[PDB]
User: Fold this.
Amino acid sequence: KHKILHRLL
Amino acid sequence: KHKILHRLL
Amino acid sequence: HMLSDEQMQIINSLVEAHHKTYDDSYSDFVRFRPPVRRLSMLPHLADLVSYSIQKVIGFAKMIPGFRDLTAEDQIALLKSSAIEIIMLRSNQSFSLEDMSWSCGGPDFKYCINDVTKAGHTLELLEPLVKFQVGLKKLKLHEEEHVLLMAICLLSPDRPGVQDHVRIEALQDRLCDVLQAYIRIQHPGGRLLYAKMIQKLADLRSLNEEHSKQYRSLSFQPEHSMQLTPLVLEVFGSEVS
Amino acid sequence: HMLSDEQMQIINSLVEAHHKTYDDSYSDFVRFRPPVRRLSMLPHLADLVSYSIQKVIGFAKMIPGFRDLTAEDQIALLKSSAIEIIMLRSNQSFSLEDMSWSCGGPDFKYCINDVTKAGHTLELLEPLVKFQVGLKKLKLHEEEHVLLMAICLLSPDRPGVQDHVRIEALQDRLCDVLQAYIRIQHPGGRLLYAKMIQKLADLRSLNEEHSKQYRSLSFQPEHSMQLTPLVLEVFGSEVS
Ligand SMILES: C=C1/C(=C\C=C2/CCC[C@]3(C)[C@@H]([C@H](C)CCC[Si](C)(C)C)CC[C@@H]23)C[C@@H](O)C[C@@H]1O
Ligand SMILES: C=C1/C(=C\C=C2/CCC[C@]3(C)[C@@H]([C@H](C)CCC[Si](C)(C)C)CC[C@@H]23)C[C@@H](O)C[C@@H]1O
Assistant:
């Protein structure tokens, strides 16, 4: 669920 | 789902 | 016969974004798992790529417009294009001398033989290196390389994008910038824009082949365990 | 006043399993992401632990009986107890001289201050080190350390176990081995078995506190991204 991408974004 | 554990086991 | 303000701003903000997210000394590489020369090189290169994805995200966030896309469109574009921006940004480390990415001494110098030892066959590395030598021959200005990365990122024709009209309108604006920049600022560059556009279609074909071989890798737990949580997120297929 | 054959076999197979999965030279540590002294030490220690989980699985597979448990019971016991076997096996690197795990020179020597820089508070590291110094004082025979690890792994009272009767019957057999081994082979060890049993209950209390702080960590993507795919599998809560 792109937990890291969201955070990085 | 422990894909790696299964493999390692 | 002259760029706009909003034109030169786009170049300025893109070029600065690149400087902030690309170290020409490759001095953070010592923090990766070391290279080893099975798939001996998979740990080091997995970290190489994951570090790189972190940078491509930083660049992306400063492309004008990108910030205002939905979180879902940002993810969709990053997930589908990350490997292309990495192949793109690596040209700045690629050496025509050696046919290798020379990020350091003998350790962070990457033969084609190193990337095999991360589970990639020649049916990928061969056109990968033809792409790199071609891209190097184009002797791009910083302004063009940066623009080429941004245009590649803002492609509407990627799986999962929802606002393909707003995205395409952003990609359009950037293409207009590259056409104009080359027209005015690059002497002898009358075939350049078209050659740069060609490099994108090569990237899609690299992307495809790489996606195949990543799947074969990612499906073997003994190999996927050597990857990072960011790599599996970005190259995985969770979908939103 | 004498061990059985099946007794001495259990000791032999356990002791050999330990030798095969524990390097006293800590010579593979150079392949981890280096230590750094935010959470500067999280990358190196995450790799330390992941490497260790790989070893604890190797040990486990050679405990007699374990192989014949269902894949689900093996996973349940490993997931709930891995951190305990790691805390256990680390005693062999812990130095009463220094109050640190000395796996190498100044780099792989781990102060309590290092583990803070991986996101652990003293409410964990304090009893962790009391546990370690206590366990070191017990001056365990290799035969006992190995047995203590196996007994800890084969606990029926762990979340997710399904065949708690077969597991407990395996744990029972091993306790009988440790009681008998100490009775016969360890002079002056008339309170030892009971002190060793005490060390298990300390492990549960460490396990609990560590599980709390891991959750807080694992819930912050900027920190969980520094972990490995094996660590998130084993310490995560997927359940079967
Ligand atoms: C990444 C960069 C650099 C080099 C990139 C390289 C050289 C090594 C092999 C790589 C990585 C290719 C592989 C086919 C990709 C494999 C991906 Si996986 C290990 C998850 C299977 C894609 C790009 C290639 C250095 C510097 O220019 C910074 C830039 O960012
Ligand atoms: C692991 C071993 C060794 C050392 C273990 C150590 C020292 C560093 C801090 C650790 C790791 C604790 C922490 C509280 C655990 C943190 C786990 Si995370 C980084 C995923 C948040 C648990 C055990 C501790 C060396 C050698 O004896 C081999 C053995 O196997």
